[PDB]
């Protein structure tokens, strides 16, 4: 958030120089350093609206990381390593499983402190299991898809 | 056949005696 201000003094304000400055802008409240900042903020212009001049051509240059996504999106490691990934997660999930089993009886409850005893809210099994499942899922499919697609075009 | 264990007690005894006399 960028704002532009001008600074006047108190004497000027009572004459009525101060209100002119404030007119014709949309406000917005901030407080990054307590009420003293806010008092100065109102006195100035009070968060002046900033818009940006752009056209579609400039935007597109900013969107893409690089040209190389074209190669890279396709690029796979080694199969052995992919197979290892699958194996590592499974083992991890297996541990969490015991903790899920007690939990399922409730674990829809508010407050993490209360949940800690009841449904094993200390190292939450729902969360651990959901993270393990998301990472495993996207990687395995993309790595299979890439290698298999490349093979049919090349061979 | 519900459990093999009752039948097996007779089998092992019987089978050894016959087999031994003949071949072994």
């Amino acid at each position: 958030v960028i704002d532009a201000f001008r600074l006047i003094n108190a004497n000027m304000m009572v004459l009525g120089h101060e209100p002119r400055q404030t007119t014709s802008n949309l406000g917005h409240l901030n407080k990054p350093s307590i009420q003293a900042l806010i008092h100065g903020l109102n006195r100035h212009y009070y968060s002046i609206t900033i818009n940006y001049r752009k056209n579609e051509l400039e935007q597109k240059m900013l969107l893409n990381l690089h040209k190389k996504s074209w190669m890279e999106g396709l690029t796979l490691q080694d199969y052995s390593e992919h197979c290892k990934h699958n194996e590592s997660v499974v083992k991890e999930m297996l541990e969490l499983a015991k903790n899920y089993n007690k939990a399922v009886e409730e674990e829809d409850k508010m407050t993490p402190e209360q949940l800690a005893i009841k449904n094993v809210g200390k190292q939450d099994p729902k969360r651990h299991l959901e993270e393990h499942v998301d990472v495993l899922m996207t990687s395995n499919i993309v790595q299979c898809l890439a290698a298999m697609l490349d093979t049919v075009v090349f061979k | 056949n519900v459990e093999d264990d009752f039948s097996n007690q007779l089998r092992a005894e019987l089978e050894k005696h016959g087999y031994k006399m003949e071949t072994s």
Binding site: Y52, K54, L57, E58, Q59, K60, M61, L62, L63, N64, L65, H66, K67, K68, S69, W70, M71, E72, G73, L74, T75, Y79, H82, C83, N86, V89, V90, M93, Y100, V104, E105, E106, E107, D108, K126, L129, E130, H132, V133, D134, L136, M137, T138, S139, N140, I141, V142, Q143, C144, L145, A146, A147, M148, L149, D150, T151, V153, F154, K155 | -
Partner: protein, 288 residues
């Protein structure tokens, strides 16, 4: 002076953005002519981190690669003002406005050496091309062929990536009416990158293909090095495709359902009998 001193080009979104702006402003020097301008950033190092770029006056005549005007004064002054502000800031190289690679750039590269050691050719196009960035990084490489003169001066592409400072990145988001299309992150992005690769792969095969027909009849000049490398792709022919599978997710969803359903099922039994009494309550509560 070294040409060889690049193998990685990391460019800020600022320099990439800067060229687009210089085209219009400069008075539309470009089109048949060219605008090349200095790149400010780190130099005298392997990885090039380009902080910024600005336009330099250039009139290009392409066809005859021996005629050009480049502003001699511009590089010197511009380097000194910037240095004080940040001392990493030096002359990294120059941008070329494409449309793609040329031989005309070879002639241009030699003069840049006297001023500052650089010869890096970054081709930053103002015209949208590629599904990704229309930016290429080129490092001048010397290779022998046996079709034409021995020892040719040519360009081998060297990997281009991107950077951005932390404030600057949040700034990139602020201008956009989106965040980004890809980042290769979670479930959703990761697939978008795969289909982007696939389209990007199809575009690549066509450049090479169209070119071979032209060699076959209606002659274009060829190099021994490019022709060999293409043959190799056929020869390398993959072997066999195996492995990779999941199914894990269904348990996660299934366990989740019974936990949320626990509350629902209980609400179901109470709610049904309550349904006629609720009408008197609802009315009352609603009345005031």
């Amino acid at each position: 002076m070294p040409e060889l001193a690049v193998q990685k080009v990391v460019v800020h979104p600022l320099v990439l953005l800067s060229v687009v702006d210089h085209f219009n402003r400069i008075g539309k020097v470009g089109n048949q002519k060219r605008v090349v301008g200095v790149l400010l950033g780190s130099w005298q190092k392997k990885v090039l981190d380009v902080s910024n770029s600005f336009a330099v006056p250039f009139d290009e005549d392409d066809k005859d690669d021996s005629v050009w005007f480049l502003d001699h004064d511009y590089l010197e002054n511009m380097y000194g003002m910037f240095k004080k502000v940040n001392a990493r800031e030096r002359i990294v190289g120059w941008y070329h406005t494409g449309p793609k690679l040329h031989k005309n750039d070879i002639a241009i590269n030699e003069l840049m050496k006297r001023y500052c050691p650089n010869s890096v050719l970054v081709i930053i196009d103002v015209k949208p091309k590629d599904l990704g960035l229309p930016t290429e990084a080129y490092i001048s490489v010397e290779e022998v062929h046996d079709d034409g003169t021995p020892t040719s001066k040519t360009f081998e592409h060297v990997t281009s990536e991107i950077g951005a400072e932390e404030a600057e990145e949040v700034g990139v988001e602020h201008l956009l009416r989106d965040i980004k299309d890809t980042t290769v992150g979670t479930l959703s992005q990761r697939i978008t990158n795969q289909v982007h690769g696939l389209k990007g792969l199809n575009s690549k095969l066509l450049d090479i293909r169209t070119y071979l027909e032209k060699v076959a009849s209606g002659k274009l000049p060829i190099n021994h090095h490019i022709i060999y490398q293409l043959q190799d792709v056929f020869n390398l022919l993959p072997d066999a495709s195996l492995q990779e599978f999941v199914k894990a997710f269904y348990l996660k969803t299934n366990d989740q359902m019974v936990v949320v359903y626990l509350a629902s099922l209980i609400r179901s039994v109470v709610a049904l009998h309550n349904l006629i009494n609720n009408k008197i309550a609802n009315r009352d509560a609603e009345k005031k």
